[PDB]
């Protein structure tokens, strides 16, 4: 089997991407944030505290003839940005772009943090990291991909995010028309539960390539690119007036600037992030200071190849017995 679904930026800055997902019988369609950096599928629901729902579409298990309470199971998650949610669990039928999984754990939110409430476009998350990170207790649950894997034509999914434009998540096949040149595959460590890999280095604009190993995770659920302070300082030093601001919480730059590209290494291959991708606009409406798309990972404990990097490539998440990650230009 295969699946193919379009993913769409939630705003003009590509802060996140939503993908329609069919849950239950008859289908309830929710727009979920596909997140290769976590492993819970959770949704706003009829059980979510009323004061914490503001515009989201909710899942109502009582209206689904295939919904079954997973008795005694609970979940609680907190993400890198400090946001969080928790609740209980149902199993139900879940379909993504024509691909159907029966008995999928659907984690129903009883509580969500303010940042989720304030984001009316995101009805939940669909985690695509390794199932060892799933937070359901006392019986850990499998991701949508983990459950679907045996039925897929090939045990893979691909992320093809657009720059200020829709993109595609495919399951079970590699669309050879969706990229240029060849796909370079690189080793993955699952020891932390992430799609963790090691980049071979970087370049700033037209500068010489610096060979240096940068361990990080491929995370569609993170907006920006987070790299070691040395690398990030080298990038912003090429932008007149750019500086790190503690009050804003990262590197800002003059909105009048033209940003240089940023290249990262995948084995012997190179992925180029256009300068425009690194511009996240005025820090506040009307401001002449703009927020940078490349930021320091120093206060995170891990480097994160988020959407800024990933949208510059066609990315293959290979969930074979020995998982690997593939990158192609597009
Ligand atoms: C490990 C480590 C340090 N972490 C507390 C910081 C991290 N945060 C994350 C995410 O929550 C970011 C959003 N997508 C899902 C993953 C991964 S690593």
CATH of the domain at 36: 2.40.70.10
CB-ligand 1 contact for 37 (6 Å cutoff): yes
- Indicate which residue's Cα is closest to atom 10 of ligand 1: 80
Rounded Cα–Cα distance for residues 163 and 311 (Å) = 6
Q: How many CB atoms lie within 10 A of CB 131?
A: 18
Longest dimension (CA), the chain: 60
Could you give the C-alpha distances from 65 to 36, 45, 100, 252, 327, in angstroms and in order? 30, 16, 16, 51, 41
Considering only CA atoms, which of 83, 100, 86 is closest in space to residue 43?
86
Catalytic residue among 199, 261, 296, 297: 199
Q: Is 258 exposed, middle or buried (0-12, 13-18, 19+ CB in 10 A)?
A: exposed
Q: In the listed set 125, 153, 174, which residue is the last one of a domain according to the structure? A: 174
185 and 139 part of one domain: no
Dihedral sign from CA coordinates of 291, 297, 299, 300: positive
Which of 15, 17, 37, 39 is the best mutation target for the ligand 1 pocket, counting ligand atoms within 8 Å of the beta carbon and taking the most? 37
Task: Answer yes or no: do 122 and 265 share one domain.
Answer: no
Print the domain residue range for 202: 175-330
Tokens 């998650």: give the residue: 77
Residues 6+ apart with CB under 8 A from 229: 296, 297, 298
Kindly give the distance from the C-alpha atom of residue 150 to the centroid of ligand 1, in angstroms, as a whole number: 28
121 and 162: one domain? yes
Say how far apart CA 231 and CA 212 lie, in whole Å: 10
Which domain-ending residue is among 155, 174, 193?
174
Are 53 and 85 in contact, with CB atoms under 8 Å apart?
Answer: no
Q: Which of 174, 191, 214 is the last residue of a domain?
A: 174
Total domain count for the chain? 2
The answer to whether the CB of 301 is under 6 A from ligand 1 is: yes
Residues 304 and 250 in one domain: yes
3-class SS letters over the chain: CCEEEEEEECCCCCCCEEEEEEECCCCEEEEEEEECCCCCEEECECCCCHHHCCCCCCECHHHCCCCEEEEEEEEEEECCCCCEEEEEEEEEEEEECCEEEEEEEEEEEEEECHHHHCCCCCCEEEECCCHHHCCCECCCCCCHHHHHCCCCCCCEEEEECCCCCCEEEEECCCCCCCCCCCCEEEECECCCCCCEEEEEEEEECCCCCEEEEEEEEECCCCCCEEECHHHHHHHHCCCCCCEEECCCCEEEEECCCCCCCEEEEECCEEEEECHHHHEEEECCCCCCEEEECEEECCCCCCEEECHHHHCCCEEEEECCCCCEEEEECC
118 with 180, same domain: the answer is no
In this structure, what token pair is assigned to residue 186? 């690189």
Contact call for residues 248 and 284 (beta carbons, < 8 A): no
- Catalytic residue flag (residue 199): yes
Q: How was this structure determined?
A: X-ray
CA of 306 to the centre of ligand 1 (A): 11
Q: Residue 329 CB: number of other CB atoms within 10 A?
A: 16
Q: Mark whether 84 is an active-site residue.
A: no
Query: What is the C-alpha separation between 34 and 36, in angstroms, rounded?
Result: 7
Residue of minimum CA distance from atom 18 in ligand 1: 80
What b/e string do you get for 64-95 counting C-beta neighbours within 10 Å, with b at 16 or more? Answer: bebbeebeebebebebbeeeebbbbbbbbbbb
Residue 60 CA to residue 88 CA, distance in Å, equals 13
Alpha carbon distance 226, 245 (integer Å)? 16
Sign (positive or negative) of CA dihedral 46, 47, 52, 57: negative
Beta-bridged to residue 270, according to DSSP, are: 265
Strands of the 243-245 sheet, one edge to the other: 243-245, 250-254, 289-292, 279-282
104 and 150, same structural domain?
A: yes
Structure-derived torsion over alpha carbons of residues 109, 111, 117, 121, reported in degrees to the nearest 10: -10
Looking at the fold, whether 165 and 20 belong to one and the same domain comes out as: yes
Q: Give the C-alpha separation, 309 to 328, whole Å.
A: 12
Q: Which residues contact 304 (CB under 8 A, 6 or more apart)?
A: 37, 80, 216, 217, 219, 222, 224, 225, 226, 297
Block residue for tokens 């950096």: 37
By the 10 Å C-beta count (0-12 exposed, 13-18 middle, 19+ buried), 39 is classed as: buried
Regarding whether 71 and 207 lie in a shared domain, the answer is no
Q: How much distance in Å is there from the Cα of 301 to the middle of ligand 1?
A: 9
Q: Which residues pair with 124 in a beta bridge?
A: 32, 43
Same domain, 39 and 139: yes
Residue tagged 């993955």 (tokens): 188
Residues 215 and 303 in one domain: yes
Q: How many CA within 13 A on the CB side of residue 304?
A: 27
Looking at the fold, whether 187 and 299 belong to one and the same domain comes out as: yes
Q: What are the distances in angstroms from CA 62 to CA 106, 110, 259?
A: 13, 15, 51
For residues 29 and 9, give the distance between their C-alpha atoms in angstroms, rounded to a whole number.
Answer: 17
Nearest CA owner, ligand 1 atom 6: 80
Label residues 297-314 b or e (16+ Cβ within 10 Å = b).
Answer: beeeeebbbbbbbbbbbb
User: With contact defined as beta carbons under 8 Å apart, do 215 and 227 qualify?
Assistant: no
For residue 107, CA distances in Å to 18, 19, 66, 69, 273 come to 18, 17, 15, 10, 35
Enumerate residues 6+ apart whose C-beta is below 8 A from 279. Answer: 259, 290, 292, 293
Cα separation of 161 and 157, whole Å? Answer: 13
Closest residue by Cα to atom 16, ligand 1, is 37
My answer on whether 148 and 225 are in the same domain is: no
């Amino acid at each position: 089997s295969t699946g193919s679904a379009t993913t769409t930026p939630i705003d003009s800055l590509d802060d996140a991407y939503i993908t329609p997902v069919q849950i239950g019988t008859p289908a309830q369609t929710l727009n979920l944030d596909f997140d290769t950096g976590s492993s819970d599928l959770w949704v706003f629901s009829s059980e979510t505290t009323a004061s914490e729902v503001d515009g989201q579409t909710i899942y109502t298990p009582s209206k689904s003839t295939t919904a079954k309470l997973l008795s005694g199971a609970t979940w609680s998650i907190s993400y890198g940005d400090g946001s969080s949610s928790s609740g209980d669990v149902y199993t139900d039928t879940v379909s993504v772009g024509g691909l159907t999984v029966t008995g999928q754990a659907v984690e129903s939110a009883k509580k969500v943090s303010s940042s989720f409430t304030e984001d009316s476009t995101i009805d939940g998350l669909l985690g695509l990291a390794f199932s060892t990170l799933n937070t359901v207790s006392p019986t850990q649950q499998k991701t949508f991909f983990d459950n679907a894997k045996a039925s897929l034509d090939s045990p893979v999914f691909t992320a093809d995010l657009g720059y200020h434009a829709p993109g595609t998540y495919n399951f079970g096949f590699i669309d050879t028309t969706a990229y240029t040149g060849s796909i370079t595959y690189t080793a993955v460590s699952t020891k932390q539960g992430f799609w963790e890999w090691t980049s071979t280095g970087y370049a700033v604009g037209s500068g010489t390539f610096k060979s240096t190993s940068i361990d990080g995770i491929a995370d569609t659920g993170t907006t920006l690119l987070y790299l070691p302070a040395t690398v990030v300082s080298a990038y912003w030093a090429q932008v007149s007036g750019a500086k790190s601001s503690s009050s804003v919480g990262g590197y800002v730059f003059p909105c009048s600037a033209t940003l240089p590209s940023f290249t990262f290494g995948v084995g012997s291959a190179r992925i180029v992030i256009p300068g425009d991708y690194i511009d996240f606009g005025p820090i506040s409406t009307g401001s002449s200071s703009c927020f940078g798309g490349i930021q320091s990972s120093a206060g995170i404990g891990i480097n994160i190849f988020g959407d800024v990097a990933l949208k510059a490539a066609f990315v293959v998440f290979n969930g074979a017995t020995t998982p690997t990650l593939g990158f192609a230009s597009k």
